[PDB]
Each structure stands twice: as structure tokens, then as C-alpha cells.
Design a protein around this ligand. Structure first.
Ligand SMILES: [Zn+2]
Lengths: 61, 48, 255, 48, 82
RNA sequence: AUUCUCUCUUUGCCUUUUGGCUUAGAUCAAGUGUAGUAUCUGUA
RNA sequence: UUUAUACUAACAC
RNA sequence: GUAUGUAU
């Protein structure tokens, strides 16, 4: 019962929008805060950078 | 000195911490773990 | 190294005594330490004072006190909205610090001037842009209500004030654009009676004798009066509006 | 602080050829501790 | 008792191995769960009752080599996207 | 003959391993009992 | 009414 | 139940 003491933990852990024009800008604003913070945490870290642009084109351009 | 603090506030985060005994063991390492971050960068060839 | 300062504030005199003070107020826009320049204009006038740092009044281009643009003489906000030349837009507490610092970063390194030919071309263009844009049954039913001082002006406010005030002493005037009506109340009835007959069928009118949910009901009454004016000049919505027009008169008569 | 003065041309010497054996000879096996193995990340006893 | 106590430790061990999050992970996710749950009640109040301002830091493209027509089409597209 | 998608076989690529540093940084599972509240289980 | 868990604990020996 | 922050 050695390999079964590990696999039994995984299966136990395994089992365990938007309206208006105004309310979207709130949603859109908070995601900007999110992104800007992750830049301050890491000056360089291009994953956070690249993402941030992609996200803005789809919304605005 | 205290008045200038009271009509300005404290300057930008930095200035200089000036070691002391409490933070010598820490700051020793920090340098070693950035002089291996040097020597590797240069030991690794031009595209690996 | 005297300041920007226009000709307009320095004043009537040729000779002018004025005092610098190397670190007074940090600039309003810029939000950084600068020099205050004080002077008097006239005999018993309260003395002037520069409100901006030169770094800014370079970029913005105005009298470091008056803030009236040097070329024209109109305010700086008024200028940026209408002419839309440099197209600046922070208007915040903190962003306006950096934005305006960023333009001081721009102009100091590469001297990008304020071109006055292209500026004047914007004005003469804006000038031309302005010009291109630019009864018996009543009086009987009216007299029946008069026997049993306010005129309903059916079918702008300043002109409604101008044309009615010249026909008597006014008590008060109203308007609603969505309503598309204005209740002109006179001080006397002799004036309101006279103004009724004078302003009947006149341009600038149906001049009678007066009597979320509120927004949608008034906006519905706007579409009703719009089709009512359009039809008289010349179908289901017209019939549905007629049913709503009949329902309002029944509520008015009953109440 | 503001953004720096835009960078210059890099003008490197031409990149040397690498080969697939060289890029395998710099293979770095992730090391694992006797002591400091925080979080979870279970590892079998035949990899120790 | 002895059979029962063996089965207890065998279940406690399955909890230890399973989760490594720590105090800070559990308390940080509850803060998300509270904030998210708070909105869903707050947004329903809005329906019941019923950085953006000026860009963070501009950094202009580069220089006029070619570009005015490109900008003309871009302005009207944002209104359509709304 | 080319391009795109789906399926199978063989092979490649990783995220640093969950931020770092100290005397393994440091010590060792006798608690029980009552009262109240909340959740779950059974009784043509 | 019984059993378990946690919260009551800003308890008590 | 404070040290320490979140909302009006
Ligand atoms: Zn200034």
C-alpha cells in the first residue's frame, strides 16, 4: 500500500457576463491595474509585456 | 533636520543602507550569487 | 531671464518694477519648484503674479499669468477644444504631472516649436466651418379657459426670452428641449393677451393659454411631437402615437 | 524616471555554428536536495 | 481501536502529501473569493436600481517616413468594437 | 502537384523545483471537562 | 434524542 | 480579537 498512498491523495484533491457600456469600462479598467502591477513587480519579464499588448488590440487597438 | 522632514517628507527609496553587523552575512551572499550569475553567462557559449 | 508674460498684463506704463523670488510655488501644471515674479499694473491695483513655470508656458504657449494664448487672446481650454492643434489630454491629478513633464522632456531635447502658420490655418478653417452648419378655433377655446397669464409656446431660450420680454413684463420663462415647449408667464394678463395675438403663427409657433420612467415618457412625447410636426407639413406608430395622444388629454381633462 | 536614449546598432561578429551535440553537452540536470525540498513536488526514491 | 487508529493516520497522511499551499496561499485565495463574491452581490444591486482616463505613459511610434491614412480608419473601428 | 484540418507512430523544446541567507535558523505531539451556536448523517 | 467536525475562546483549572 | 489591512 505504498504507491496507493500517493494516488489516493490526487483523486481526493481532484474531486475537490458583462452588460452596458459603463460596466465594461470598470471591468476593462481593473484588468489594466492588474497588468500595470505585474510590470512594476518585474521590470523585465517579457511574458507580462507581450500579453499586455495583445490584450489591448482585441479591446481597442 | 527634523523640520525639513516635516515640510518635505523622506526622499526616494534608496539612499544607501551601509551594511553593519546585522546585514553582512546576507549581503555577502547576494554578491556571490551575482558573481556566479556573471561567470555562467560568460562560460555559456553564443547560443545554448 | 525675465518671464514669459504677455503685453496685456504688464500694462499701460513702459517702465515696470518687478521682483523675482527664486523658489516660490511649485507650478500648478508642472508640479515642480519654480520662480515667482511679482509686479503692479496700475495705480491702486492688486499686484500680479506668474502662476506657471516657464517649462510649461513654453509647451502650452501663454502669458505666465493671464494664460490667454499669445496669438489669439482666447483661454487655453477654449483653444484646445475648438482648434484641437496640439491635442493634449491628461486632465488628472497625477497623469498630468508626467504628461506635462514628458512634453518638457520632448521640447528641451528636440526644439519642436509652435508653428503659427499651420495654427492660423486651423482658425480660418474653423471660421468657414461655422457658416456651413448654419387659429380661430384656438382663440375661442382659449377665451373659454380665460373666462373660467401664462402662454404655452408649442412648435432657443435666449430668443424665447427676447421675443416675449419685448411684449410685456415677464414673471418667468421655461423650456424643455425634449419636451420641446416653453411656458411664458407674464406679470399682467394685458401683456399675455397682447403677446398671444402678436406671436401667433410666427417664426424665431403655437401660442395658446397655459394650464428612468419620467425620462422614457418625455422621450416618448418627443417622438410624438416630431411626427405631429412632420405630418402637418405633408403608420402603426402614428396610430399608436394618436392613441397615446388621446390618452394624455383624457387624463388632463379628468384631473 | 523617463525612458532612455534609443539604442544603437549592435554590429556583432557573425554567429558561430553550434551543432546538436554541443547544445546537448550543456544539458543541466535539475538538482534536487537532501534537505530543502519545499512546496510539494514528490520525487521517487530511485531518483535520489 | 488499533485497527481504527491505523486508518486515521492513513487518512491524515493523505492530506499532508496532497497540499503544499501554506497559510499565505489559503488566506490569499479567501481574499479573492470574498472580493469576487462581494461583486456578484454589488452588481445585482446595480441591476436592481436600474488608468483609463488618459493613458499611463505614451511612447510615440518612431518617425514620419511613410502614415496619416492608417490612423483615420483606426478611430472609427473602436466605436464599432464597443 | 500544392495548401489547410483531423488521427496514429518515432523524435525535439522547456517553467528553474514552488523566490534568497543563517546555529539542519530553533525546539517536540498528555491535554481534558462543561455550556452555547452552525453544518452533516441516522431514527380515432 | 444520539454521533462527529469546526466555530464560538475575547473561558477555567 | 489586537498587532495589520479591506468597505461605507
Ligand atoms: Zn511649470
Amino acid at each position: 500500500x505504498x504507491x496507493x498512498x500517493x494516488x489516493x491523495x490526487x483523486x481526493x484533491x481532484x474531486x475537490x457576463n458583462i452588460t452596458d457600456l459603463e460596466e465594461l469600462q470598470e471591468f476593462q479598467g481593473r484588468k489594466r491595474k492588474e497588468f500595470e502591477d505585474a510590470i512594476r513587480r518585474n521590470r523585465l519579464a517579457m511574458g507580462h509585456w507581450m500579453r499586455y499588448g495583445q490584450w489591448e488590440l482585441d479591446q481597442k487597438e | 533636520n527634523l523640520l525639513a522632514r516635516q515640510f518635505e517628507g523622506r526622499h526616494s527609496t534608496g539612499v544607501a543602507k551601509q551594511i553593519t553587523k546585522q546585514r553582512v552575512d546576507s549581503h555577502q551572499d547576494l554578491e556571490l550569487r551575482a558573481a556566479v550569475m556573471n561567470d555562467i553567462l560568460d562560460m555559456i557559449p553564443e547560443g545554448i | 531671464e525675465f518671464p514669459s508674460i504677455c503685453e496685456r498684463c504688464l500694462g499701460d506704463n513702459s517702465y515696470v518694477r518687478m521682483t523675482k523670488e527664486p523658489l516660490g510655488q511649485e507650478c500648478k501644471i508642472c508640479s515642480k519648484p519654480c520662480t515667482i515674479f511679482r509686479w503692479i499694473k496700475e495705480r491702486g491695483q492688486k499686484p500680479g503674479k506668474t502662476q506657471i513655470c516657464v517649462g510649461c508656458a513654453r509647451y502650452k504657449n501663454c502669458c505666465q499669468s493671464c494664460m490667454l494664448d499669445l496669438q489669439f487672446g482666447l483661454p487655453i481650454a477654449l483653444r484646445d477644444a475648438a482648434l484641437k492643434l496640439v491635442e493634449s489630454g491628461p486632465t488628472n491629478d497625477i497623469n498630468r504631472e508626467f504628461f506635462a513633464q514628458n512634453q518638457q522632456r520632448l521640447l528641451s531635447n528636440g526644439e519642436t516649436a509652435y508653428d503659427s502658420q499651420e495654427a492660423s490655418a486651423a482658425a480660418r478653417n474653423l471660421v468657414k466651418k461655422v457658416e456651413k452648419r448654419e387659429x380661430x378655433x384656438x382663440x375661442x377655446x382659449x377665451x373659454x379657459x380665460x373666462x373660467x397669464a401664462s402662454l404655452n409656446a408649442e412648435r432657443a431660450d435666449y430668443k424665447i426670452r427676447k421675443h416675449f420680454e419685448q411684449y410685456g413684463p415677464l414673471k418667468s420663462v421655461v423650456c424643455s428641449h425634449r419636451a420641446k415647449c416653453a411656458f411664458v408667464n407674464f406679470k399682467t394678463r394685458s401683456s399675455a393677451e397682447i403677446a398671444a395675438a402678436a406671436s401667433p403663427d410666427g417664426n424665431v409657433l403655437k401660442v395658446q393659454w397655459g394650464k428612468x420612467x419620467x425620462x422614457x415618457x418625455x422621450x416618448x412625447x418627443x417622438x410624438x411631437x416630431x411626427x405631429x410636426x412632420x405630418x402637418x407639413x405633408x403608420x402603426x406608430x402614428x396610430x399608436x402615437x394618436x392613441x397615446x395622444x388621446x390618452x394624455x388629454x383624457x387624463x388632463x381633462x379628468x384631473x | 524616471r523617463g525612458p532612455p536614449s534609443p539604442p544603437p546598432p549592435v554590429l556583432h561578429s557573425p554567429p558561430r555554428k553550434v551543432s546538436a551535440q554541443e547544445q546537448q553537452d550543456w544539458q543541466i540536470p535539475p538538482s534536487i536536495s537532501n534537505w530543502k525540498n519545499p512546496k510539494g513536488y514528490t520525487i521517487p526514491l530511485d531518483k535520489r | 481501536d488499533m485497527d481504527e487508529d491505523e486508518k486515521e493516520m492513513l487518512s491524515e497522511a493523505r492530506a499532508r502529501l496532497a497540499n503544499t499551499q501554506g497559510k499565505k496561499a489559503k488566506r490569499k485565495d479567501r481574499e479573492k473569493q470574498l472580493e469576487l463574491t462581494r461583486r456578484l452581490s454589488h452588481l445585482q444591486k446595480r441591476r436592481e436600481l436600474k488608468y483609463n482616463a488618459s493613458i499611463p505613459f505614451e511612447k510615440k511610434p518612431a518617425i514620419g517616413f511613410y502614415x496619416x491614412x492608417x490612423x483615420x480608419x483606426x478611430x472609427x473601428x473602436x466605436x464599432x468594437x464597443x
